[PDB]
Amino acid sequence: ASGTALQEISFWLNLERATVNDYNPLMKDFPLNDLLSATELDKIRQALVAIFTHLRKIRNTKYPIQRALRLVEAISRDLSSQLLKVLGTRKLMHV
């Protein structure tokens, strides 16, 4: 529950550089960084679809369900933070 999905994928890669083979397809190339990098709300939803497409790889892995659920919650936390970030610039009251 502690830490973002970006931290989780890096930690799994670090464990691979120290289980990991079974979850390697899922952690091969997550697009969570792309969602964080995007400053456009339309790009963020498109990036979210890509993150879910990468998550589909869980079927061909031995990943427990609860841990992938926790990763989903971390993704949601990052999404909420990024949505607040992009909304704060627009000054919704003034427009």
Nearest to 75 by CA among 93, 50, 42: 50
Structure tokens given for 85 = 């970030």
Task: Determine the Cα angle at 33 with ends 32 and 37, to 5°.
Answer: 120
Method of determination?
A: cryo-EM
Which residue shows structure tokens 């990052």?
78
- The answer to whether 51 and 31 are in contact (CB under 8 A) is yes
Own/partner contacts of 25-30, CB < 8 Å, gap of 24 or more, are 25/57, 25/60, 25/61, 26/54, 26/55, 26/57, 26/58, 26/61, 26/63, 26/68, 28/57, 29/54, 30/5, 30/6, 30/54
Task: For residue 32, give every residue at least 6 positions away whose Cβ sits within 8 Å of its Cβ, in sequence order, or none.
Answer: 4, 5, 6, 9, 51, 75, 78
The number of CA neighbours under 13 Å toward the Cβ of 26 is 25
Q: What letter would DSSP give residue 93? A: T
Q: Which amino acid is at 6?
A: L
Instruction: Tell me the one-letter amino acid at 83.
Output: L
